[PDB]
Design a protein around this ligand. Structure first.
Ligand code: ATP
Ligand code: ATP
Ligand code: NA
Ligand code: NA
Lengths: 50, 530, 220
RNA sequence: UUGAGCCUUGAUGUGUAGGAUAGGUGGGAGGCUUUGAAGUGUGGACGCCAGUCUGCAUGGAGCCGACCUUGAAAUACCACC
């Protein structure tokens, strides 16, 4: 509805992304969560893009 | 062709503009008009490449260069004028940064012999020899002294130092030019020069402005930033006006026709569709209303601020009396022994034309002490409202917008009043949570009116009250300030405002001070200039 | 005048032969002079990009027919080796700054990677005429003695105009035809080798050979 | 009648500071003008209006580079644009 989809692209250099939904009215800035990257097998930072 | 794809910038809660995808360039000049709070400057610094957009991308050929006019004055105060006007061509300036840095340490070893020896060929092929004297007779075209433009950037008086930044924009022979608010708070003759020079070179300038004249002189296409989209109308300012008006009016007429033939159809559907033996005669129309489907209409971003100034406690007889007026800083006394008296209800139009004390007299009157004038005096119950041309200092603070407005809620005004005084100014609770120092020039100016409302002052002072403001927020002032019963002293640099608002005229000539009663029309007839 | 009567003597649209064109040049040369003849080739490139520029230097097989008083800007061992190289300059900090302060210029600039006096002493004059040494042009080289041959043997330099046309002297009108032929051919071949990578289209769009005062014609 | 493009030909592209409306190269530095001049007899076009371009010639056989202040040099002249 109002909460639409974004993807958290990996900042470990590879092509990997988790998918989540974010309320774009209240939060206008990106998401920054440390999430597991299985290609490199370590916890890197995961910025959002689309 | 510099191209942009699906930018969709979101600032706080609502996108100023979404999924814009458009090509630019080709050697044309594009205006960038829009409503005062429409994020056009944000789009401009997205296009240049300063800040990354929320979505999408902007691609320009790496060799082709951009030249953007930045407002960061005295960001170059450390070094001199003739190189700060050159450093706007970044590719040839790092050349000097390396040439004058490698040399110093002794000596030119066998890595110097090939890192700096063929560094000067960069100088040659970027035309570094003809750098100052090609920028010299550009700073002179602007008017930054004539031969004195040198020494520390603090040497040039901060009154008009930003003309160096303006001349920095087009020195580099740039293909892309992105001058942003080029001639705000500026004079007329140098504007004439800029209008004539901009279209001499063959570039692809994107120009953002609000005056009709500049856009018509130096434009070939126009872009809007209305309804969250930029659609390019070829032509001029008047051409855009007529095109936009005609298209919106035809849309609001197509809407009327669709509404009429939908309402008539729905009448039949409501009459039928429940009849026991004629029910199936509404279903050839129930499916036809499903095929008219009037197109989405989006609220126009123009709007009108309901500005209304109201006095608190009115006064009588003399508003002020000033005698002794004499003050000068470097050149000498700008005005010597100026005597004037203002009855209540008077309106003054004290215009100066770029550096005659046109603002420092107002600063003295509101209070900026140590003049030779010992007989400046206000009325007794006087309450003063001040609009200085520098809105930066009042917003050098991390206060949110609403709480910043809440510095002066008078005894009787609540959250409801302090927030309705900005809701009246079409500011949204959407934007009520943002820090103060992030608003545009026109938005800051209108917030200053939202502060002038609170104090309910019987004296108003305005120093170029209209700057970076669009047409509508100047029309609201023209139709609201004229219905103000208290004293008014202002200086509008433009012409129509003073000709339609003035009651008395008082200008500081570079050697003396004039005075005249009667509006700017009668003053123009007295002068002899039409 | 002469140029209202030879305008009909020379045709512009017609492309002449290599030998016939130089014969026409020799038959059009009238004014008393050595009349160093030149050639301008329209290289097909865009000057708006630095990567496509053609800055070069090559030695002609016959020579230009004139000598240049190249100044050796060196010091130390480098400035001492050039003394016996048959040059016309001395490399030192004083002889560069003060000596060249009033002096106009030399034909070429000696390579001075050993000293530290011939770096920026040129200033407005040493760079406005393009007299600074460069690595691509070979002016700034470590072998001063070897570069003496290029300085004295006719190390012709060439740089693009802001459009993309390279013109340089190919000899004098006193030179013979079978010598001017190979002289032009050597420079043309050097340009072909020096051609950059991303030079789209055909690079040699015209070869206009001419004299100082005569006419200018195409050859191919 | 006129648009679009190309070859050719010819004009125009000054502040300062300098003789003076110097486009970049760079060939050269002594060449242009008397199968009829610098200046004079005289129109129009352009123009930041100070000045350039232009029928011929009674008279005509003499003007421009070196110096110079400039980032750079000069219709001394041609070239490719
Ligand atoms: N940090 C921020 N957070 C939220 N919104 C912001 C921020 N900075 C700017 N904005 C918004 O972005 C828009 C900026 O508009 P813009 O600067 O283009 O205005 P303008 O007056 O037309 O331009 P200008 O006066 O700069 O020429 C406004 O809606 C403003 O509220
Ligand atoms: N503190 C100061 N120090 C030095 N010079 C100053 C100072 N204040 C003003 N001046 C100079 O004195 C003159 C007064 O200019 P002023 O500040 O009145 O601006 P204005 O161009 O007349 O108007 P406005 O500020 O309204 O745009 C200007 O030449 C300015 O440079
Ligand atoms: Na802005
Ligand atoms: Na000002």
């Amino acid at each position: 509805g109002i909460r639409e989809k974004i993807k958290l692209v990996s900042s470990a250099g590879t092509g990997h992304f988790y998918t989540t939904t974010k309320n774009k009215r209240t939060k206008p800035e990106k998401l920054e969560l440390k999430k597991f990257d299985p290609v490199v097998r370590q916890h890197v930072i995961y910025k959002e893009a689309k | 062709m510099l191209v942009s794809s699906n930018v969709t910038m979101q600032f706080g809660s609502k996108p100023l503009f979404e999924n814009i995808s458009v090509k630019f360039g080709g050697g044309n000049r594009y205006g960038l008009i829009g409503a005062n709070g429409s994020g056009k400057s944000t789009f401009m610094k997205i296009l240049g490449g300063d800040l990354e957009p929320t979505l999408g991308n902007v691609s320009l050929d790496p060799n082709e260069r951009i030249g953007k006019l930045r407002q960061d004055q005295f960001a170059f105060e450390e070094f001199t004028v003739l190189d700060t006007v050159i450093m706007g061509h970044k590719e040839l300036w790092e050349v000097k940064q390396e040439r004058d840095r490698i040399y110093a340490l002794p000596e030119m070893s066998e890595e110097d012999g090939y890192k700096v020896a063929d560094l000067e060929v960069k100088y040659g092929e970027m035309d570094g020899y003809s750098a100052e004297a090609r920028a010299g007779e550009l700073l002179l075209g602007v008017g930054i002294p004539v031969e004195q433009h040198y020494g520390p950037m603090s040497e040039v008086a901060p009154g008009w130092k930003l003309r160096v930044l303006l001349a920095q924009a087009l020195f580099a022979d740039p293909d892309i030019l992105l001058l942003d608010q080029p001639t705000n708070n500026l004079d007329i003759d140098t504007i004439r020069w800029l209008e004539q020079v901009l279209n001499e070179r063959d570039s692809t300038m994107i120009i953002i402005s609000h005056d009709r004249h500049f856009l018509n002189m130096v434009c070939t296409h126009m872009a809007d930033l209305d309804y969250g989209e930029l659609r390019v109308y070829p032509g001029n300012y008047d051409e855009y006006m007529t095109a936009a008006t005609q298209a919106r009016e035809r849309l609001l007429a197509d809407n009327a026709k669709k509404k009429a033939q939908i309402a008539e159809l729905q009448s039949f559907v409501s009459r039928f569709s429940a009849n026991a033996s004629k029910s199936r005669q509404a279903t050839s129309r129930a499916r036809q209303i499903d095929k008219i489907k009037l197109e989405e209409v989006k609220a126009s971003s123009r709007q009108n601020p309901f500005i209304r100034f109201e006095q608190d406690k009115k006064l009588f007889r003399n508003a002020l009396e000033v005698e002794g007026l004499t003050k000068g800083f470097d050149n000498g006394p700008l005005f010597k022994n100026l005597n004037l008296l203002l009855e209540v209800g008077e309106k003054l139009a004290v215009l100066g034309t770029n550096g005659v004390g046109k603002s420092t007299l107002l600063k003295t009157l509101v209070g900026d002490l140590q003049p030779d004038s010992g007989t400046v005096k206000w009325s007794e119950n006087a309450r003063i409202g001040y609009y200085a041309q520098d809105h930066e200092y009042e917003f050098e603070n991390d206060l949110t917008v609403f709480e910043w407005m809440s510095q002066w809620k008078q005894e009787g005004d609540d959250e409801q009043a302090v927030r309705s005084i900005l809701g009246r100014l079409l500011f949204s609770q959407d934007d009520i949570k943002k820090p103060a120092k992030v608003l545009s020039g026109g938005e800051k100016g209108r917030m200053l009116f939202g502060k002038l409302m609170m104090q309910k002052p019987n004296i108003l002072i305005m120093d170029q009250p209209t700057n970076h403001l669009d047409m509508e927020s100047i029309e609201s002032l023209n139709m609201a300030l004229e219905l103000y019963q208290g004293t008014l002293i202002f200086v509008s640099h433009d012409r129509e405002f003073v000709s339609s608002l003035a009651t008395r005229i008082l200008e500081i000539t570079p050697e003396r001070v004039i005075d005249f009663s009667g509006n700017y029309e009668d003053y123009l007839r007295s002068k002899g200039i039409e | 005048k002469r140029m209202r009567v030879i305008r009909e003597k020379v045709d512009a649209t017609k492309q002449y032969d290599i030998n016939e064109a130089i014969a026409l040049l020799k038959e059009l040369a009238t004014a008393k002079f050595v009349e160093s003849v030149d050639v301008a080739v329209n290289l097909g490139i865009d000057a708006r990009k630095s990567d496509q520029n053609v800055r070069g230097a090559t030695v002609l097989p016959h020579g230009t027919g004139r000598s240049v008083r190249v100044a050796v800007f060196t010091q130390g061992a480098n400035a001492e080796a050039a003394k016996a190289a048959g040059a016309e300059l001395v490399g030192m900090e004083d002889l560069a700054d003060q000596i060249k302060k009033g002096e106009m210029n030399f034909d070429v600039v000696i390579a001075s990677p050993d000293a530290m006096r011939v770096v920026g002493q040129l200033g407005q004059v040493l760079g406005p005429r393009g007299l600074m040494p460069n690595p691509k042009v070979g002016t700034v080289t470590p072998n001063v003695a070897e570069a003496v041959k290029n300085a004295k043997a006719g190390q012709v330099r060439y740089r693009n105009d802001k459009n993309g046309i390279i013109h340089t002297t190919i000899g004098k009108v006193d030179f013979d035809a079978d010598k001017l032929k190979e002289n032009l051919e050597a420079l043309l071949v050097a340009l072909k080798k020096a051609k950059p990578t991303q030079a789209k289209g055909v690079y040699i769009k015209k070869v206009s050979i001419s004299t100082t005062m005569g006419a200018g014609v195409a050859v191919d």
